[PDB]
Design a protein around this nucleic acid. Structure first.
Lengths: 85, 52
DNA sequence: TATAATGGGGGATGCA
C-alpha cells in the first residue's frame, strides 16, 4: 500500500529525473573543483540539507564527522560563492 | 504587424508610402520525450540561443 | 553493468 502511493513514471518524467541526477553529479564534481574540498563530503551535505534534519550521522568513508554545526559551516561556505559558482 | 515610422511622397494624384513595419512570425517545433525544454514562457531569445 | 520488465500467496475464565 505504501508503494502504491508513489505514481508510475512517464518516459518524459523518467528521463527528466535521471537527467537531473546526472547533472547533479557533474555539478558536485565541479563544486569540489571550485571549493577544493571533497566530493563525497559535499554531496553528503547536499543530501543532508535535502532530506532535512531527520537524518544526520557520520558516514563511514568521510573524514569529517557530520554534525549540524559542521554542515552549517559548509553550507555557509556554499553560500559564499559567486552567482556563476 | 505594426508600423513604426510612416513616410510618404506626393506624386500626381497618388502617394508613395514608406513604411517601417514590425511583426512576429511563428515557427512550430516538435519536442521529443528524450529532449528537455530549457527556455521559459515568453522568453526573449536571440540568434543562437538554445531553446531545447 | 543497458531489449523491456514496476502492488504476494475445545473450553472456560479473567480483564479492557
Amino acid at each position: 500500500h505504501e508503494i502504491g502511493q508513489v505514481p508510475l513514471l512517464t518516459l518524459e518524467e523518467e528521463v527528466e529525473l535521471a537527467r537531473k541526477v546526472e547533472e547533479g553529479m557533474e555539478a558536485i564534481k565541479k563544486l569540489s573543483e571550485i571549493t577544493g574540498l571533497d566530493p563525497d563530503l559535499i554531496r553528503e551535505v547536499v543530501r543532508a540539507k535535502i532530506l532535512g534534519s531527520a537524518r544526520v550521522r557520520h558516514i563511514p568513508g568521510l573524514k569529517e564527522t557530520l554534525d549540524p554545526k559542521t554542515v552549517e559551516e559548509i553550507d555557509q561556505k556554499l553560500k559564499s560563492l559567486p552567482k556563476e559558482h | 504587424v505594426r508600423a513604426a515610422q510612416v513616410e510618404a511622397e506626393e506624386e500626381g494624384e497618388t502617394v508613395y508610402l514608406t513604411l517601417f513595419l514590425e511583426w512576429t512570425e511563428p515557427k512550430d517545433y516538435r519536442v521529443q520525450p528524450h529532449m528537455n525544454v530549457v527556455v521559459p514562457e515568453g522568453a526573449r531569445v536571440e540568434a543562437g540561443d538554445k531553446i531545447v
